[PDB]
Design an enzyme around this catalytic site. Structure first.
Site, PDB file in Angstrom:
ATOM      1  N   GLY A 179     -12.705  26.457 -26.326  1.00 28.17           N
ATOM      2  CA  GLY A 179     -12.744  25.166 -25.666  1.00 28.17           C
ATOM      3  C   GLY A 179     -13.474  25.183 -24.348  1.00 28.17           C
ATOM      4  N   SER A 180     -13.843  24.001 -23.871  1.00 29.62           N
ATOM      5  CA  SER A 180     -14.537  23.817 -22.600  1.00 29.62           C
ATOM      6  C   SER A 180     -14.239  22.428 -21.997  1.00 29.62           C
ATOM      7  CB  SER A 180     -16.037  24.130 -22.712  1.00 29.62           C
ATOM      8  OG  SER A 180     -16.856  23.003 -22.966  1.00 29.62           O
ATOM      9  N   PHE A 204     -11.586  23.226 -16.970  1.00 28.98           N
ATOM     10  CA  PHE A 204     -11.001  24.551 -16.812  1.00 28.98           C
ATOM     11  C   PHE A 204     -11.939  25.823 -16.567  1.00 28.98           C
ATOM     12  CE2 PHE A 204     -11.364  24.447 -21.517  1.00 28.98           C
ATOM     13  CZ  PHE A 204     -10.940  23.171 -21.826  1.00 28.98           C
ATOM     14  N   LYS A 207     -11.805  33.429 -20.257  1.00 25.94           N
ATOM     15  CA  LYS A 207     -12.109  32.203 -19.540  1.00 25.94           C
ATOM     16  C   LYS A 207     -13.112  32.405 -18.415  1.00 25.94           C
ATOM     17  CE  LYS A 207      -9.897  29.458 -16.335  1.00 25.94           C
ATOM     18  NZ  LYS A 207      -9.260  28.174 -16.021  1.00 25.94           N
ATOM     19  N   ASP A 255       0.329  19.910 -15.375  1.00 23.53           N
ATOM     20  CA  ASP A 255      -0.424  19.398 -16.533  1.00 23.53           C
ATOM     21  C   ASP A 255       0.286  19.738 -17.856  1.00 23.53           C
ATOM     22  OD1 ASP A 255      -2.500  17.906 -17.747  1.00 23.53           O
ATOM     23  OD2 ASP A 255      -4.018  19.497 -17.556  1.00 23.53           O
TER      24      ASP A 255
HETATM   25  C1  2HV Z   1      -6.571  28.395 -29.811  1.00 23.13           C
HETATM   26  C2  2HV Z   1      -6.247  29.463 -28.813  1.00 23.13           C
HETATM   27  O1  2HV Z   1      -6.047  30.625 -29.150  1.00 23.13           O
HETATM   28  N1  2HV Z   1      -6.193  29.041 -27.507  1.00 23.13           N
HETATM   29  C3  2HV Z   1      -5.896  29.809 -26.397  1.00 23.13           C
HETATM   30  N2  2HV Z   1      -5.987  29.286 -25.200  1.00 23.13           N
HETATM   31  C4  2HV Z   1      -5.638  30.232 -24.257  1.00 23.13           C
HETATM   32  C5  2HV Z   1      -5.702  29.913 -22.812  1.00 23.13           C
HETATM   33  O2  2HV Z   1      -5.252  30.694 -21.970  1.00 23.13           O
HETATM   34  N3  2HV Z   1      -6.246  28.705 -22.543  1.00 23.13           N
HETATM   35  C6  2HV Z   1      -6.816  28.207 -21.341  1.00 23.13           C
HETATM   36  C7  2HV Z   1      -6.658  28.926 -20.152  1.00 23.13           C
HETATM   37  C8  2HV Z   1      -6.950  28.334 -18.937  1.00 23.13           C
HETATM   38  C9  2HV Z   1      -7.419  27.046 -18.884  1.00 23.13           C
HETATM   39  C10 2HV Z   1      -7.628  26.331 -20.049  1.00 23.13           C
HETATM   40  C11 2HV Z   1      -7.369  26.908 -21.288  1.00 23.13           C
HETATM   41  N4  2HV Z   1      -7.738  26.189 -22.464  1.00 23.13           N
HETATM   42  C12 2HV Z   1      -8.405  26.841 -23.597  1.00 23.13           C
HETATM   43  C13 2HV Z   1      -9.164  25.865 -24.461  1.00 23.13           C
HETATM   44  C14 2HV Z   1      -8.264  24.743 -24.912  1.00 23.13           C
HETATM   45  C15 2HV Z   1      -7.627  24.058 -23.720  1.00 23.13           C
HETATM   46  C16 2HV Z   1      -6.899  25.048 -22.842  1.00 23.13           C
HETATM   47  C17 2HV Z   1      -5.278  31.447 -24.741  1.00 23.13           C
HETATM   48  S1  2HV Z   1      -5.386  31.464 -26.454  1.00 23.13           S
END
Ligand code: 2HV
EC number: 2.7.11.1
Length: 274
Positions: free
Chosen positions: A14-15, A18, A36, A136
Site C-alpha cells: 500500500g501507499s 504513511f 515501509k 487513527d
Molecule cells: C496486508 C499486510 O500484510 N499489511 C501489513 N501492513 C503492515 C504495516 O505495518 N502497515 C503500515 C505501517 C505503517 C503505516 C501504514 C501501514 N499500512 C500498510 C499498507 C496498508 C495501510 C497501512 C504490516 S503487514
C-alpha cells in the site's frame, strides 16, 4: 548491516500518507516482514530517541509499544537514508485487513464482532499503558492473522504521546473523528479514542460507518442499518455520546453486558475464519 542485503523486497502492500509499504522477507530466517519507506520532507512530526537522535514520531511510538504483545504490529528495525526513513515491521501470513474482511462478508455476527472488538480494546489499552495514543483506529489499520484469529494494530503515523491535556492537532480519519474535533478543533486522548471505537463497532455489526458528513457527526443520531441487539446498540450509542465526559472508560466498555463471554482468538479462527 545494509537493508538491501538483510531484506528481500516483494510487492507493494500500500501507499498513501504513511507513505510506501512493501511486503518483504528477512533473508537470515525467511521471516515475513513489511518494509515501509517515507520521505524525510513528507514527515510532519519528529521525535527524539532516549539516546537523542532526530527520528519521525512513528519510530518513537512503535518502539514504546513494540515489546512484546501480539495486539500491535511490532517495529523489528529501522534505517535512515539521506532523503528517507525505512521501517521494518512484522507481517502476518496469511493476513487480511479488517476493511477487506467486512467488504467481503458484510455485517459481522455479534459473536465475531465481540471477539474482534475485545482484541482492539486490549491492543488500544496496551498502547495507552505504554504512553501512546494511536489517533487513527479504523478498519483499514487493523490486520487479522487468519491462522491464529488475532487482530494487529498498524500505522502509528497519525499518533502522539498520550497526555491528560487537550490536543489541538489531528491528521487521522475524519469520519472516525469526534464531534469536539469538528466543532472546536480540540479533543482529549481517551474520550476521542472511545468515540472512534464506537464508529468501529458500528462498522463491524452494520458493515459500514454510521456517519459520512460533519453535520451527521455533530448531530450524533445513530440509525442502525442492520439487525443489532439492544445491548450492542447501547454500547455503540454510549461510545458515540456527544459529550466526551458521557462516553464510557475502557473499563466500562469491557464490563458492558454485550462484552461478556468473549471467544478466545484460536476458537474465533476455528468457528469464524476456517
Ligand atoms: C496486508 C499486510 O500484510 N499489511 C501489513 N501492513 C503492515 C504495516 O505495518 N502497515 C503500515 C505501517 C505503517 C503505516 C501504514 C501501514 N499500512 C500498510 C499498507 C496498508 C495501510 C497501512 C504490516 S503487514
Amino acid at each position: 548491516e545494509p537493508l538491501e542485503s538483510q531484506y528481500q523486497v516483494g510487492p507493494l502492500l500500500g501507499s498513501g500518507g504513511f507513505g510506501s509499504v512493501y511486503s518483504g522477507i528477512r533473508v537470515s530466517d525467511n521471516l515475513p516482514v513489511a518494509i515501509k519507506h517515507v520521505e524525510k520532507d513528507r514527515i510532519s512530526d519528529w521525535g527524539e530517541l532516549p539516546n537523542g537522535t532526530r527520528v519521525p514520531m512513528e519510530v518513537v511510538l512503535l518502539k514504546k509499544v513494540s515489546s512484546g504483545f501480539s495486539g500491535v504490529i511490532r517495529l523489528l528495525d529501522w534505517f535512515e537514508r539521506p532523503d528517507s526513513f525505512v521501517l521494518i515491521l512484522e507481517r502476518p501470513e496469511p493476513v487480511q485487513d479488517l476493511f477487506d474482511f467486512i467488504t467481503e462478508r458484510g455485517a459481522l455476527q455479534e459473536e465475531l464482532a465481540r471477539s474482534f472488538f475485545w482484541q482492539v480494546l486490549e491492543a488500544v489499552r496496551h498502547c495507552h499503558n505504554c504512553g501512546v495514543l494511536h489517533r487513527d483506529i479504523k478498519d483499514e489499520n487493523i490486520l487479522i492473522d487468519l491462522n491464529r484469529g488475532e487482530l494487529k494494530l498498524i500505522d502509528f503515523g497519525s499518533g502522539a504521546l498520550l497526555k491528560d491535556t487537550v490536543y489541538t492537532d489531528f491528521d487521522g480519519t475524519r469520519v472516525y473523528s469526534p464531534p469536539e474535533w469538528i466543532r472546536y478543533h480540540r479533543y482529549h486522548g481517551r474520550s476521542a479514542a472511545v468515540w472512534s471505537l464506537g464508529i468501529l463497532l458500528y462498522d463491524m455489526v452494520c458493515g459500514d460507518i454510521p456517519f459520512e458528513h460533519d453535520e451527521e457527526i455533530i448531530r450524533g443520531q445513530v440509525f442502525f442499518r442492520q439487525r443489532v441487539s439492544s445491548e450492542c446498540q447501547h454500547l455503540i450509542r454510549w461510545c458515540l455520546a456527544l459529550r466526551p465526559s458521557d462516553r464510557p472508560t475502557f473499563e466500562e466498555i469491557q464490563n458492558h453486558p454485550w462484552m461478556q463471554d468473549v471467544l478466545l482468538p484460536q476458537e474465533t479462527a476455528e468457528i469464524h475464519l476456517h
